[PDB]
Design a protein around this ligand. Structure first.
Ligand SMILES: *[C@@H]1O[C@H](CO)[C@@H](O[C@@H]2O[C@H](CO)[C@@H](O)[C@H](O)[C@H]2NC(C)=O)[C@H](O)[C@H]1NC(C)=O
Ligand code: CLR
Ligand code: NAG
Ligand code: K
Ligand code: MG
Ligand code: TL
Ligand code: TL
Lengths: 268, 39, 992
């Protein structure tokens, strides 16, 4: 033929069949032992998610949400993702004492449901009403963005203490139980309005620590609705929403490390 | 610890780099020694 | 074009002096007119040689920039700029990826260009050396007056004059001469002075006395002649053009390189476009379809391989430089290993090029002297009183002297003023009797008759050094038979005795044997003149026989030859044991050529020519079956009337071939004949008459000390110490580097698979990219480099000089067996070890292997800063990318770890590491430096930006260890099978 005879062509097939078969069987074996060394409830390493990311619902083309108020299908793209998220926080999804629980309607302290063990059933998560998100189809004019803190197993978000000076200096400082979120731009051509649990501009600490998908399915993380009823129009406004805390840090590279990058433009 | 389990989300990449560079250097020296056993 | 120049020349030495003038419109006495000479100048053109048109270095460099790998790397470099252009227009990408990767790849092409350019070097100044043989000026007779003119202004027809010490300015017809002798070594390779006279003495113009040639010099006397040829039209000017004009051609090693380039280029374009369409079918945007292609290019092309080859060659050439063997062309480092036929000059190559005493006949006994340079033999006789009598004649009846200031150099190597035979005798006595000058001071010469054409003897009368005599001793030497007709007694073991027919017959026997050995034989005799008949003041007349020259005492015979170099016989046998055919090709006479052939082992004992059979059986040569003769001796005059097909039959039908009295073109023809049969041929030589053959040879080797400038220009290799044993070393080195290149190539190729497979699974699996493009270049250009080179220092696995020369048609540098092992077996194991570490990194950070399938869509989505892992955690864009790049880093390090084992297995093709050992210090160096480089690239701060290399946790380093070990075991088991059964299965499938 090309290389060899039929007899040789066969033998080279019988070899590579057994050979690659063995190699596949060995590869799988090493994957088995790897998995055997891992927990079902907690990942081996967590230093790469460490400082929590802050992500929002409006799917930004490039950290930007520009549209026209005087146009219907101009914002119907951002309403798709906005709906996708909030559709999960339905009351019909949170039914019965299992696996949900009614928690303080005001920001409270942490809740420990034991260890990362299966020695108990599904760890009961705090309910969250999308109805706590006042004012927010969504904002056809002047968007109503929804913030979110990335989930990390066993992470206890710790707010800053009012020992020294603060950006939003001491205003509504629920020091003991709220992780604040203050959006900014100089360039003050807007109108910041925050909505959340208990009416505070933060995340209620009663939703922590997260026990993971395996030990807490259907779990709901707290949301923080933000509305920009800015009196300006037809210009790119670089708005940055920042979260503050002891366990919260940022990076010049990762522009989502505990903060937002939104470029709103109501070009109408 | 409980609420004070910050060490869980931390890794000493600084020491690791110091050690890694020490090792790389020493392996580089060892190599020179064996090569220079005759030039 | 040069087929005309490969033919024997035609001449006009047969014409009379007068007749020759009519042909050139010339005067025998007055010479040309100033006006007629200038007319002929403009007519024929200058008496000069024009160098052939060369290829500029520009075109030579750029021709390498387009050879398979460079072509693919160019397509990659441009395709980078393509994707970059498409980006800069569509979505403003502030990145530098495609732009920088395009710059990097273009640089890789340029630098790789320098390496191949360095390897494909051609240092040739043939025509320049020939031009150096034309004198600046010549002496001509114009308008009846002699004047010096620019030799280029010399034309056919003018009257030229030459004298001892000057170069022949052009081909001349001798019309007048006085004691003129010439050095025709340019045409023959033999430096013994040849007389020139107006008389025609041979039909063959290269042998007649009435022609003098350009490229030669007058050694003594004076001559006048008419110019018959000028410039390019001279006999050796044509040889110049032939030699300088010959197409170089591709080396065996070069052909091998291009061959695997086709193979690897083939699989590259195959998988390249095979997966380019496979991606579009899967609905991949052309934006991405090209990005994957660039990666495929980089994965398939072994970026550092061609440069490795060059370095391995260079390092092999450095070792040979250290044995006095200079390599002018890097590729010639290997040709000697692939050589199946050596065509060797005799004089100054196989031989020392110096008349040396070989045997002596005295006391009715043949004695043998030591002919070797360094005198590696033993003594023959010292005791016999006869010896001292013969020794005295050899010293006394000798007019040769050592040049001043030689006392530093060895006797046999020092320059001597005199003819070759007298120098030989001088050096013979000086060696075994001490200072000859002393013997010539103790015995003052009073009268002598120098060797005469008519007398055929030379005699001398000396004052006997003996005090009790202080009388007159007569000594003489000459033609053995002439000396015999002048002898009455023979000095036997001390005492004289009558010359009976018995001893006279033993003389003839001794004389015939020595002459049969191709040796020049001389007779020696002396006579102690009677005291009473010769007073202490008796005057001797040299002009008229004033003393007896008959009834003298015969002392002995001495024989001499230009002997082989000490190492030559043994080197010839070694070449022949390696299955290399050795042919002699010489301008010298057949009797001498044949005798040295037997001396060095070109013709082995018992082997006969058709002429030998005929003489032994006493039958006509036509009655001899030519197939009964394995040896042959072909004279150039017969070679001339043979067609190439008939030359091919001679080459095919004889194992032991001697081509004697060959011209320079004839040497070229014999070389081409050998090549025509499909053989790789080496030429060894030292003369300008070897230049065409040396050029045409697959590899020409010139002698460094004895070699002429031309020969060393025409060669690929120079033996700087004239050590012929270096050929044996060269062939051995050549074979070793050929095997080691295979090892180094397999090693380099093996790591291509773990660079290809990640890109494929990236498409078919939709997982995060396991390894990056930049990461690949850190391997092929970084870590693999020193290890790959180090394989050039591997010792032989068996006695390579015991095997036959490779068949260049069947035995390839890269075959299917190499690809099967490198791509199908070992590289495949490396790929898995890479993937394993990849799955380990991701799974330990929260992305278990199961959830990875079909996630790249969301993984690469820059706007999703919340991807969910297996544990329910959310990752930003840059966070997951850090883990991904950490995956690139550990996959990279996994390659390094699996290349550890590969380096050790590529060490040997057959033998076990437990047999070959670990005595390669460069290889061990490679292991340490490779690992140092990898660690540095991972842990050095800032490398995460420039190369996207991230620090690895200690446990990460050990992921591929079980795969590294399986490689070592697998290959060790496999080679154990090879050795345990030379049959073929494992052998014919995987044996590189
Ligand atoms: C989650 O809540 C949303 C609230 O808008 C539900 O949307 C409803 O969709 C139905 C049918 O398309 C409409 O008739 C209603 O007007 C919507 N709102 C309400 C309050 O009922 C959505 O269907 C819910 N999703 C799930 C899975 O239950
Ligand atoms: C990533 C995976 C799926 C690709 C696997 C590719 C396999 C099928 C390839 C890789 C190397 C290949 C072999 C390389 C060498 C030879 C020897 C030659 O004389 C015949 C073909 C043969 C035997 C090839 C057959 C196919 C082969 C085994
Ligand atoms: C939000 O909606 C409420 C009614 O639910 C209305 O009273 C109020 O004006 C709205 N706020 C703004 C800022 O438009
Ligand atoms: K050559
Ligand atoms: Mg010679
Ligand atoms: Tl490569
Ligand atoms: Tl490679």
């Amino acid at each position: 033929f090309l290389g060899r005879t039929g007899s040789s062509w066969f033998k080279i097939f019988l070899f590579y069949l057994i050979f690659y078969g063995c190699l596949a069987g060995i590869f799988i074996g090493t994957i088995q032992v790897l998995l055997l060394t891992l927990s079902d409830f907690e990942p081996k390493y967590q230093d790469r998610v460490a400082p929590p990311g802050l992500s929002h619902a409006p799917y930004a083309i490039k950290t930007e949400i520009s549209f026209s108020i005087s146009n219907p299908k101009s914002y119907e793209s951002f309403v798709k993702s906005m709906h996708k998220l909030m559709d999960l926080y339905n009351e019909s999804s949170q039914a019965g004492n299992s696996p949900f629980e009614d928690c303080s309607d005001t920001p409270a302290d942490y809740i420990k449901r034991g260890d990362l063990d299966d020695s108990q059933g599904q760890k009961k998560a705090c309910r969250f009403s999308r109805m706590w998100l006042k004012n927010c189809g969504y904002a056809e004019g002047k968007p109503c963005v929804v913030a979110k803190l990335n989930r990390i197993i066993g992470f206890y978000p710790k707010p800053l203490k009012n020992t020294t000076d603060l950006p939003e200096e001491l205003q509504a400082n629920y020091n003991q139980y709220v992780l604040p979120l203050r959006c900014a731009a100089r360039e003050k051509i807007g109108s910041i309005e925050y909505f959340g649990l208990g009416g505070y501009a933060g995340f209620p600490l009663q939703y922590y620590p997260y026990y993971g998908k395996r030990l807490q399915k259907k779990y709901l993380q707290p949301l923080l609705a933000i509305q920009f009823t800015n009196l300006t129009q037809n210009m790119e406004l670089r708005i940055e929403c920042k979260v503050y805390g002891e366990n919260i840090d940022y990076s010049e590279k990762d522009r989502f490390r505990g903060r937002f990058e939104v470029k709103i433009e109501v070009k109408s | 610890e409980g609420p004070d389990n910050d060490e869980r989300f931390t890794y000493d990449y600084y020491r690791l780099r110091v050690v890694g560079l020490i090792v790389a250097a020493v392996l580089c020296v060892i190599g020179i020694i064996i090569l220079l056993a005759g030039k | 074009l040069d087929e005309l120049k490969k033919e024997v020349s035609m001449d006009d030495h047969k014409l009379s002096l007068d007749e020759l003038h009519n042909k050139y419109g010339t005067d025998l006495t007055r010479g040309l007119t100033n006006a007629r000479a200038k007319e002929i100048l403009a007519r024929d053109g200058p008496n000069s040689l024009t160098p052939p048109p060369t290829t500029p270095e520009w075109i030579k460099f750029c021709r390498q920039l387009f050879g398979g790998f460079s072509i693919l790397l160019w397509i990659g470099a441009i395709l980078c700029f393509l994707a970059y252009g498409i980006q800069a227009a569509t979505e403003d990408e502030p990145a530098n990826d495609n732009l920088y990767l395009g710059v990097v790849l273009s640089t890789v092409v340029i630098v790789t260009g320098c390496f191949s350019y360095y390897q494909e070097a051609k240092s040739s100044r043939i025509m320049d050396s020939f031009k150096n043989m034309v004198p600046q000026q010549a002496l001509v007779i114009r308008d009846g007056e002699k004047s010096t003119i620019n030799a280029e202004f010399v034309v056919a027809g003018d009257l030229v004059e030459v004298k001892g010490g000057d170069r022949i300015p052009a081909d001349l017809r001798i019309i007048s001469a006085h004691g003129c002798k010439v050095d025709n070594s340019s045409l023959t390779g033999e430096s013994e002075p040849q007389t020139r006279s107006p008389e025609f003495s041979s039909e063959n113009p290269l042998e007649t006395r009435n022609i003098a040639f350009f490229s030669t010099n007058c050694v003594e006397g004076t001559a006048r002649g008419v110019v018959v040829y000028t410039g390019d039209r001279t006999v050796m000017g044509r040889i110049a053009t032939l030699a300088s004009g010959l197409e170089v051609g591709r080396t065996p090693i070069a052909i091998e390189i291009e061959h695997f380039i086709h193979i690897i280029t083939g699989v590259a374009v195959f998988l390249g476009v095979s997966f380019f369409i496979l991606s579009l079918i899967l609905g991949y945007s052309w934006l991405e379809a090209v990005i994957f292609l660039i990666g495929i290019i980089v994965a398939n092309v072994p970026e550092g391989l061609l440069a490795t080859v060059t370095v391995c060659l260079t390092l092999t050439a450095k070792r040979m430089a250290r044995k006095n063997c200079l390599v002018k062309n890097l590729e010639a480092v290997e040709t000697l290993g692939s050589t199946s036929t050596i065509c060797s000059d005799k004089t100054g190559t196989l031989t020392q090029n110096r008349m040396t005493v070989a045997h002596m006949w005295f006391d009715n006994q043949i004695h043998e002297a030591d002919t070797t340079e360094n005198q590696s033999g033993a003594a023959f006789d010292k005791t016999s009183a006869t010896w001292s009598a013969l020794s005295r004649i050899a010293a006394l009846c000798n007019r040769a002297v050592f040049q001043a200031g030689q006392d530093n150099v060895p006797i046999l190597k020092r320059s001597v003023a005199g003819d070759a035979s007298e120098s030989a005798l001088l050096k013979c006595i000086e060696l075994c009797c001490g200072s000859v000058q002393g013997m010539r001071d103790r015995n003052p010469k009073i009268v002598e008759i120098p060797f005469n054409s008519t007398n055929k003897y030379q005699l001398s009368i000396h004052e006997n050094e003996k005090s009790s005599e202080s009388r007159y001793l007569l000594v003489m030497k000459g033609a053995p038979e002439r000396i015999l007709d002048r002898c009455s007694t023979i000095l036997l073991n001390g005492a004289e005795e009558p010359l009976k027919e018995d001893m006279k017959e033993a003389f003839q026997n001794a004389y015939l044997e020595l002459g049969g050995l191709g040796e020049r034989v001389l007779g020696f005799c002396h006579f102690a003149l009677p005291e009473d008949k010769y007073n202490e003041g008796y005057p001797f007349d040299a002009d008229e026989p004033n003393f007896p020259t008959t009834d003298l005492c015969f002392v002995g015979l001495m024989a001499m030859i230009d002997p082989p170099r000490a190492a030559v016989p043994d080197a010839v046998g070694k070449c022949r044991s390696a299955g290399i055919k050795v042919i002699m090709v010489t301008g010298d006479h057949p009797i001498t050529a044949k005798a040295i052939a037997k001396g060095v082992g070109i013709i082995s004992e018992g082997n006969e020519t058709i002429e030998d059979i005929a003489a032994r059986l006493n039958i006509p040569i036509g009655q001899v079956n030519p197939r009964d003769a394995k040896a042959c001796v072909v004279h150039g005059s017969d070679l001339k009337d043979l067609s190439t097909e008939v030359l091919d039959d001679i080459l095919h039908y004889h194992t032991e071939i001697v081509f004697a009295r060959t011209s320079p073109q004839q040497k070229l023809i014999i070389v081409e004949g050998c090549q025509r049969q499909g053989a790789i041929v080496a030429v060894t030589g030292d003369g300008v008459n070897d230049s065409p053959a040396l050029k045409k040879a697959d590899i020409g080797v010139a002698m460094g000390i004895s070699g002429s400038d031309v020969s060393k220009q025409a060669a690929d290799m120079i033996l700087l110490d004239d050590n012929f044993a270096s050929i044996v070393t060269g062939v051995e080195e050549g074979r070793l580097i050929f095997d080691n290149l295979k090892k180094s190539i397999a090693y380099t190729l093996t790591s291509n698979i773990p660079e290809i497979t990640p890109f494929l699974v990236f498409i078919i699996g939709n997982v995060p990219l396991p390894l990056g493009t930049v990461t690949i270049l850190c391997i092929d250009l970084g870590t693999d480099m020193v290890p790959a080179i180090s394989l050039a220092y591997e010792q032989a696995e068996s006695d390579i000089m015991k095997r036959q020369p490779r068949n260049p048609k069947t035995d390839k540098l890269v075959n299917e067996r190499l690809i099967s092992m490198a791509y199908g077996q070992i590289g495949m194991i490396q790929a898995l070890g890479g993937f394993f570490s990849y799955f380990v990194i991701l799974a330990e950070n929260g992305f278990l292997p199961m959830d990875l399938i079909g996630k790249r869509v969301r993984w690469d989505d820059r706007w999703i800063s919340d991807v969910e892992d297996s544990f329910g955690q959310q990752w930003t864009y840059e966070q997951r990318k850090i883990v991904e790049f950490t995956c690139h880093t550990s996959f990279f390090i996994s390659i390094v770890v699996v290349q550890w084992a590969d380096l050790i297995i590529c060490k040997t093709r057959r033998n076990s590491i437990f047999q070959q050992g670990m005595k390669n210090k460069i290889l061990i160096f490679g292991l340490f430096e490779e690992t140092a480089l990898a660690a540095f690239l991972s842990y050095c701060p800032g490398t995460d930006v420039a190369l996207r290399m991230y620090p690895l946790k200690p446990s990460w380093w050990f992921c591929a260890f079980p795969y590294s070990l399986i490689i070592f075991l697998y290959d060790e088991m496999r080679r154990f099978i090879i050795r345990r059964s030379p049959g073929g299965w494992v052998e014919q499938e995987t044996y590189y």
